[PDB]
Amino acid sequence: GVRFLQPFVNLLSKGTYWWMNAFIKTAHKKPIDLRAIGKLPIAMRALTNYQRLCVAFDAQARKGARAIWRALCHAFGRRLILSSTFRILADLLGFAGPLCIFGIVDHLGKNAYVLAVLLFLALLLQRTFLQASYYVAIETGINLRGAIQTKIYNKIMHLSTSNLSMGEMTAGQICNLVAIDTNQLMWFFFLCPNLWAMPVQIIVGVILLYYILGVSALIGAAVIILLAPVQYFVATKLSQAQRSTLEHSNERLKQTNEMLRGMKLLKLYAWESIFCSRVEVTRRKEMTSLRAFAVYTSISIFMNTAIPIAAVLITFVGHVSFFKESDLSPSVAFASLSLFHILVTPLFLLSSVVRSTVKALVSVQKLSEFLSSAEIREECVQIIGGFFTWTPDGIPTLSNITIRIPRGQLTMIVGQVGCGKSSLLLATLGEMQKVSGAVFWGPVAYASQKPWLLNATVEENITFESPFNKQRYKMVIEACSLQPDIDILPHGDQTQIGERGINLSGGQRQRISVARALYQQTNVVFLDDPFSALDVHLSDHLMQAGILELLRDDKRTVVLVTHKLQYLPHADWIIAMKDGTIQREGTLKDFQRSERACTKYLSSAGILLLSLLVFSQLLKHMVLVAIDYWLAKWTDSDQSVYAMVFTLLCSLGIVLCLVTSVTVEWTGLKVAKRLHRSLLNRIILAPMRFFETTPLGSILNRFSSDCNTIDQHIPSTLECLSRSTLLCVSALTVISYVTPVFLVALLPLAVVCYFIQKYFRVASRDLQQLDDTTQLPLLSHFAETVEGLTTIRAFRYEARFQQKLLEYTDSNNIASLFLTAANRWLEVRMEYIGACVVLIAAATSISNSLHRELSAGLVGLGLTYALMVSNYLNWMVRNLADMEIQLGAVKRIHALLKTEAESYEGPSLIPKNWPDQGKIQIQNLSVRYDSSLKPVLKHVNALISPGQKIGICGRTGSGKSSFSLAFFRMVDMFEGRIIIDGIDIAKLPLHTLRSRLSIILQDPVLFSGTIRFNLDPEKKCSDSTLWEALEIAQLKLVVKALPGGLDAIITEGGENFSQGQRQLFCLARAFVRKTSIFIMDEATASIDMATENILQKVVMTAFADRTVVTIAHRVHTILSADLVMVLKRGAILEFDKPETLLSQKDSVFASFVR
């Protein structure tokens, strides 16, 4: 069952893609689908390409960055060679055409119709073989893409998480790798067959022009030899800028990644200016690289036009009067112009080719450095002599661990923050094979400390490739405290969980991960603090239902690592860790007995610059057509008059063309930088609702792809399109002038071409849309596999995931293949149209201009322009399609620009310093996340006296985090009044409101850089200040134990710091901010109670003269406060006296909970 049949048709059809007819006809009748399009052939599957590639890679290794390149060239092989041979034959015929022109003109001056028929056949043949060469190059490229994609996906498996902690294996870096390297390698492998025919082409060009010029060859030969070395030097100066360009863009992308996943914390206390100025500086450096590249390309185009025109002028002048004394018959003149144009076209192309060439080189260097990452080491739960560290060599954290875990038994690991608990969990998991030690125990379910979700439905995230079960799934759901929240969602179930779970809450994702690890059938289950983002009551219900009733039912083995009170009397073994060592060991008793798109684009381009561009282009082309017409009327013959006219026009042409190129490059640069500056400040001024709503992957990929296309694809493509359209205009005008009868044969051509273009347009749009809709999920899958590595390699589901990726990549490949096949079919029929027009143009010429018109000079112009446009027609159509795609790109940028309604900040209270008196009062407050949705708060009324500690309590979904977010005006549908020292938002813009408070979140984020950049991005602190802030935040000892104390390199999250240490760093931000009001949303989330109590005591003794409002799921912290308010289903209630607030409720909500 297949629909694509290129290898499955007859000899004559493969060239024309006749088979496509049905398909393109079918597409208009019914829209296209993935089940509509077929499967991939036997010789097209990514499995066989990966097979061939790995076999060649092995053969190359038995005999580095160069090795894989050799292997690629080997693997494509014969197909690639064939593409080159087809192109060379097409080139020889393309040169053959102008010779037929020479013969026709010669017989016109005096076996002529034969010249027309043979010329028509030759042109048709060249077109056929050129399009076949392009098709086979595209085939080789798509197979390359598939093979290297599956190779890197297989290698991501054996990659160790110690690389993932480093910047080299950054998830964003790996997805950038996949996407941009697909792109760059595919484009280089489409342009490589084109350049493997430039040398043979130029050689045949000169060997043909000798026999036409004679002794006057010297001038053209000197010109085309003087061209080469200066071009080599220019290309060198170009490549040097381009490589640094790539480095700077690669760092900008990671800065954007770490800027967007933390826009909440960024806008919370408004660190925006710092990150925005940093991205602006990176953009300025990138722009320096780009402007160097653009000036060099402008000089390149200047040379590639100026040297040619001088060559033509010199050669002709030399032949007529300088030495030769043989009158150049017009045939020689026009044939020389034709061969010369054929020679000129490759030189313009090679300059654009370098852009893809150095990019392919850089992409392969990156791919080889990625393949050279560290492997994974091939080998009751038993451990004797534990010893391992996180590098090939270094000081260890795992030292002398001995542990026995009998089946059907609960084991609580406990210990301070940073005691190798998760590390013991991962080493036991075999993900980290110890240096020296024995470990014995299978497919093990496991819920990691930082959960992750798949781009799928909830039911799918909980099944995880296992078949469904009526009672099993319902039990796992009804034990995880998840059914009410699931039913509250917009779709009662199968809700498409967004990327990473943005449209989910903090506790929801944790409960979903625990449900996944609890639903699967296995012996051993590891639970890595599954109680961080849960309250007291949900934790009690989950531990009682799933862990004690559901798990202990089947007598499975459970290793659960957390720190609570209820769990200890329930487990059988207890393991105390300290500084990577087991302090004590055993059971409990023995342990207790032991010791709208193009308008703004053109406006940003400038009404003065694009106008000058169009004007200069038109003027240059008018000069070019006029000089050729004048020369034609002169050749068939005031000789000095014509000589001066020719010499004047030959300088006018180069002046005008140089001006055109310079203007085009300037326009491109301006568009690039204005668009980027607009984009970033449109994203910065967005509300948090827009950031949570929008999928972030779309934002980032649109950002990178669109900006790269505009920076590097829009100038060249736009200028080539303009050149081709002006060439077409010139050719049509010339043919109309030479034969006023051709206007009878032009309308049928236009009508047929118009109808076929209309038919192609809808099928092309459909194929492009399907291409995008299949290309998004593949990259989603790549990202999710890269981040959720530990779980996938714990289950040992690697076969299932590799099979899934094979499915997705095969669908992507078939979509791309059909898009390029439709492209090829349109090109072939357009080339047949061009053959028709040139044929009957030459026929009407040889008939009319000889029999009845009797004109000599017009024949050369007519045939030259016809042979020129017969190729520039297809070239022009391709350039127009490229411009359309890039303009749709620009259009999606412009559509992204204008959303995120202003929500902007908009001086009587600013001039007065923000008061230290922390007296605040909220009267009749409500809150709604989305406009016209359910209310979250209702009739909120509270007051807070100056300099007093304030506690808040409540169940899940009560509204504590909503209370905090509304205290910062992060929820845009609040109703009521918020007064702070007789001062509210009535006279204050949002910036002074972002500077007045401090906030610590339950979700700890940490962007890469140094410790100084995480602690104070403003760089306005002394080192003693930060050392004191760390010694107060109970973090000094773990900071001193790192290389480069205050300058240790931090990566985004990673394992350089556990969750508790990230919480402590957020606390340190709060310490150094030095504001009057504090908000603390669960600073207890991932800190041990033993350290948490003393940490809270020290943080109370430190922040004595300022108001602090806390929301902690720890009872004792709530107990220590004076004014505590309990949030209800929608409302609150305040109470002050510790002895009165505990018996007034009749001991219900605050006493028995304690």
Q: Which residues are annotated as a binding site for ADP?
A: 390, 418, 421-422, 449, 689, 692, 929, 957-962, 1055, 1058
417 binds, among ligand ADP, Mg ion, none (CB under 5 to 8 A by kind): ligand ADP
Helix and strand element counts for the chain (H, E): 38, 20
Which segment (331-339, 420-428, 491-499, 656-664) binds ligand ADP by CB under 6 A? 420-428
Least Å distance, CB 903 to ligand ADP, is 15
CA angle 254, 255, 257 (to 5 degrees): 60
DSSP secondary structure letters along 937-956: EEEEEEEE-TT-EEEEE--T
The rounded distance, in Å, linking the Cα atoms of 498 and 697 is 10
The answer to whether 80 and 193 are in contact (CB under 8 A) is yes
CB atoms inside a 10 Å sphere around CB 1012:
15
Applying CB under 6 A, does 785 fall inside the site for ligand ADP? no
510-to-393, 486, 507, 539, 931 alpha-carbon distances in Å: 35, 13, 5, 11, 28
Pairing of strands 1107-1111, 557-561: unpaired
Give per-residue burial for 244-267: e unless 16+ CB within 10 Å, then b: ebbebbeebbbbbbbbbbbbebbb
Kindly state the smallest distance separating residue 448's Cβ from ligand ADP, in Å. Answer: 11
Look up residue 507 and give its two tokens. Answer: 């506790």
- Measured from the CB atom, the residue of 535 and 719 that comes closer to Mg ion is 535
Number of residues that bind ligand ADP (CB under 6 A): 27
Smallest separation, CB 506 to Mg ion (Å):
6
- Smallest separation (angstroms) from ligand ADP to the CB of 786: 16
User: Of 961, 1034, 1051, 1117, which lies in the binding site for ligand ADP, with binding defined by CB under 6 A?
Assistant: 961
For position 526 contacting ligand ADP by CB under 6 A, the verdict is no
Touching ligand ADP, residues 487-516 (CB under 6 A):
505
Give the whole-angstrom CA distance, residue 1027 versus residue 1036. Answer: 7
The dihedrals phi and psi of 759, each to the nearest 5 degrees, come to: -65, -40
Residue pair 376/426 in contact (Cβ under 8 Å)? The answer is no
In whole angstroms, how close is the CB of 131 to ligand ADP at the nearest point? Answer: 53
Tell me how far, at minimum, the Cβ of 419 lies from Mg ion, in Å.
9
Element (H, E) at 684: helix 639-684
Which residues, at least 6 apart from 36, have a Cβ–Cβ distance to it below 8 Å? 3, 30
- CA distances (Å), 632 to each of 210, 645, 992, in order? 22, 13, 76
546 binds, among ligand ADP, Mg ion, none (CB under 5 to 8 A by kind): none
Chain centre distance of CA 624: 43
Q: Which is nearer to ligand ADP, 690 or 1027 (CB)?
A: 690
Closest distance of CB 1044 from ligand ADP, Å: 15
Per-residue interface string for the shown chain with ligand ADP, residues 381-410, x marking contact by CB under 6 A: ---------x------x-------------
Instruction: Take residue 760 and report the two structure tokens written for it.
Output: 């192609």
Annotated binding site for ATP: 161-163, 165, 390, 418-423, 449, 563, 1058, 1060
**Quick check: 1062 binds ligand ADP (CB under 6 A)?**
no
User: What does the alpha-carbon distance between residue 532 and residue 527 come to, in Å, rounded to a whole number?
Assistant: 11
- Contact residue for ligand ADP among 201, 338, 791, 962 (CB under 6 A): 962
| Residues counted in the chain | 1154
CB atoms closer than 10 angstroms to residue 1092:
23
Task: Decide: is 539 part of the binding site for ligand ADP (CB under 6 A).
Answer: no
Considering beta carbons, is residue 580 or 715 the nearer one to Mg ion? 580
Binding residues, by number, are 161-163, 165, 390, 418-423, 449, 528, 563, 689, 692, 929, 957-962, 1055, 1058, 1060
- Report the distance separating Cα 668 and Cα 671, nearest Å: 5
Tell me which residue has its CB nearest to Mg ion.
961
Among 409, 785, 956, 1063, the residue binding ligand ADP under the rule CB under 6 A is: 956
Considering only the stretches 417-425, 889-897, 1067-1075, 1117-1125, report the one whose residues sit in contact with ligand ADP under the rule CB under 6 A. Answer: 417-425
Q: Which residue in the set 305, 816, 1034, 1059 belongs to the binding site for ligand ADP (CB under 6 A)?
A: 1059
Nearest of 326, 1010, 278 to residue 684 by alpha carbon: 278
Please report how close the Cβ of residue 371 comes to ligand ADP at its closest, in angstroms.
21
- Site residues, Mg ion (CB under 5 A): 422, 449, 961, 1058
Answer whether 956's CB lies under 8 Å from 538's CB: yes
In the bound state with ligand ADP, the residue whose beta carbon lies nearer, of 396 and 947, is 396
Instruction: Tell me the CA distances in angstroms from 34 to 20, 31, 808, one per residue in order.
Output: 17, 10, 12
- The torsion angles phi and psi of 348, rounded to 5 degrees, stand at -60, -35
Integer Rg of the chain from CA = 36
HSE, side-chain direction, 13 A CA sphere, residue 724:
22
Q: How far is the CB of 1116 from Mg ion (least distance, A)?
A: 20
Q: Which of ligand ADP, Mg ion, none does 882 bind, CB closer than 5 to 8 A by kind?
A: none
Residues of the binding site for Mg(2+): 422, 449, 528
Which one of residues 172, 220, 386, 420 is an interface residue with ligand ADP (CB under 6 A)? 420
- Residue the block writes with tokens 């073989």: 129
Q: Is 1050 in the site for ligand ADP (CB under 6 A)?
A: no
Residue 83 or 962: the one with the smaller Cβ distance to ligand ADP is 962
Q: State the nearest-atom distance from the C-beta of 940 to Mg ion, in Å.
A: 17
User: Which of the ranges 189-197, 198-206, 867-875, 950-958 carries the binding residues for ligand ADP, by CB under 6 A?
Assistant: 950-958
Given the complex with ligand ADP, which of 262 and 418 has the nearer CB atom? 418
Q: Which two tokens stand for residue 964?
A: 């905090």
The binding site for ligand ADP (CB under 6 A) comprises 162, 165, 390, 397, 417-423, 505, 692, 929, 936, 956-962, 1055-1056, 1058-1060
